[PDB]
Amino acid sequence: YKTKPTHGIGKYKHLIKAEEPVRAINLGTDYEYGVLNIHLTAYDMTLAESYAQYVHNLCNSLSIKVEESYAMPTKTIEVLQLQDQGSKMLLDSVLTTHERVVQISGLSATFAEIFLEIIQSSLPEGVRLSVKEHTEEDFKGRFKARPELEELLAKLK
């Protein structure tokens, strides 16, 4: 009851984060990096995932906020090979590139050195660590191509 010293003892909504409904991306300050995209490309999916999983728990262990962990579409490259003493290039290998992303944010500037060292140290054989800064270009690259918008865009050109 409001007039009582115990008023508000049942308050709880201030302890929760405000989740009241697209979303603006928050860039980092001058002493912390913004959203960072830890890409993990590889020819063996199991190795791409096993290391993406490893770095999620690693980030989780270091109290580094992991905004999102997602997979990028698979790229299928057909290795063609010139036949011996001939001309017709005959396919032999069909390789596939599996990329996995672990999106973090709030990495301290001074601590980024220690973190970057640990992750590169543990990199498996066959996997490429590409750590870049998150940008709208990367986010848009995960969405299907829209041919209609391109056709209408040509009219404006």
Partner: peptide, 29 residues
């Protein structure tokens, strides 16, 4: 009209400035 609490109120020692940083009861138990 308000009466001040007679002692520490529940949940007062929780720093809500760094809400997103604080650990959570991810579990029921």
């Amino acid at each position: 009209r308000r009466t001040p609490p007679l002692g520490p109120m529940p949940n007062s020692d929780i720093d809500l400035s760094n809400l997103e940083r604080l650990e959570k009861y991810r579990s029921f138990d």
